[PDB]
């Protein structure tokens, strides 16, 4: 039973996901999701699929941006591991309310 030391083949896949460009949010969950959010303002509108793809690209872009900020917060936090306090610190630095 052979078993890797932790997080290193994870970093090999960090090299994999930073060798690429793609989306990762799958389409029917985000479709159902944005129909739930646009449901909450005025109901039952038809859309564009390109609208869904535009919101999905902006979603994953702002995600991986704040994931790299949270990684830099855990580095300055003298840690290998992250916390929600890294995220909360990032919101009060960026001024989010």
């Amino acid at each position: 039973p052979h078993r890797y030391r932790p997080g290193t083949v994870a970093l090999r896949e960090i090299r994999r996901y930073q060798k690429s460009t793609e989306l990762l949010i799958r389409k029917l969950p985000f479709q159902r999701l944005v129909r739930e959010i646009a449901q909450d303002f005025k109901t039952d509108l038809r859309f564009q699929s390109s609208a869904v793809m535009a919101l999905q690209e902006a979603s994953e872009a702002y995600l991986v941006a704040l994931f790299e900020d949270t990684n830099l917060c855990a580095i300055h936090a003298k840690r290998v591991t992250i916390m929600p306090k890294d995220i909360q610190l990032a919101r009060r630095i960026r001024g989010e309310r």
Partner: protein, 105 residues
């Protein structure tokens, strides 16, 4: 040769640009060579972008350019990564920016 741009050796239509400057509510009247200078800066920056786009497709061995190459071409050049940091390219892709403290040892 109908075009005003071949009189200046450009490639971008100063009649079209002068039209959308006249029909755009930017200014009231629109001069002659200020659209020529604007089309010159436009033509220079599209040559300068597609320079490094050809470079980044060239080392990635591609002809029909995927915008990974475009994201490299903006984000590497810190005159233009400075100037165009606000806009993510769709299917841009991220750099390997891996800090040493989380690298193994």
């Amino acid at each position: 040769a109908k075009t005003r741009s071949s009189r200046a050796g450009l490639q971008f239509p100063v009649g079209r640009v002068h039209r959308l400057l006249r029909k755009g509510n930017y200014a009231e009247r629109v001069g002659a060579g200020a659209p020529v200078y604007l089309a010159a800066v436009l033509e220079y920056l599209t040559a300068e972008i597609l320079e490094l786009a050809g470079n980044a497709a060239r080392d990635n061995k591609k002809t029909r350019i995927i915008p990974r190459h475009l994201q490299l071409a903006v984000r590497n050049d810190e005159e233009l990564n400075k100037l165009l940091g606000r806009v993510t390219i769709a299917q841009g892709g991220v750099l390997p920016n891996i800090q040493s403290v989380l690298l193994p040892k």
